[PDB]
Ligand SMILES: NCCCCc1ccccc1
């Protein structure tokens with residue numbers, strides 16, 4: 001997260017860190033045994049880390065649980081990142097509490113101008129590299145579909161939206177991938193891609209979760 005703030009411990013209780021010996025992507029807890037992330041975060045050997053603030057220190061509210069199954073979206077295209085969504089089932093159910101809680105799926109899509117909360121442990125610089133240990137947060141509005149498509153000609157599909165600031169300075173970045181965009185209490189986006197971070201006229205692109213709710217609900221119910 002570039003241009004954001006320190007969230008504070010456990011203030012984003014649905015935020016997960018995906019770990020394969022190191023943090024590599026975020027995700028969102030959507031019930032006790034299922035996490036939503038980006039398909040581009042797919043890998044073997046994932047441990048889901050719940051209840052994290054500092055990812056390099058054991059602070060007392062963590063739950064570490066191996067993934068038992070990953071399900072990349074049937075139509076994920078790694079070339080274009082269309083359908084950049086993946087479900088991860090936990091080997092055992094998380095113990096739900098204050099510090100570890102699920103986030104609701106959308107009932108309908110969000111509108112341009114709606115403010116959302118984006119969070120992660122990604123790079124905090126556009127001027128180089130610096131990875132935080134504690135969770136970072138950013139409030140940002142959903143941008144109009146036309147400003148998104150103007151920013152990224154030929155590359156935005158109906159399964160994507162842009163959020164942030166065309167002026168630059170405030171964005172998601174490397175390491176935030178797969179994490180949440182929460183608007184009005186619902187998971188409306190997943191950190192998906194962009195051109196650099198926090199650059200002028202290049203806002204972040206996010207998977208549009210409202211298009212996937214029926215797939216998520218059917219998949220969970222069958223698995
Ligand atoms: N604002 C876009 C978010 C950055 C996502 C990302 C994923 C993988 C490699 C670099 C960046």
Ligand SMILES: [Ca+2]
Nearest residue numbers: 054057058059
């Ligand atoms: Ca920790």
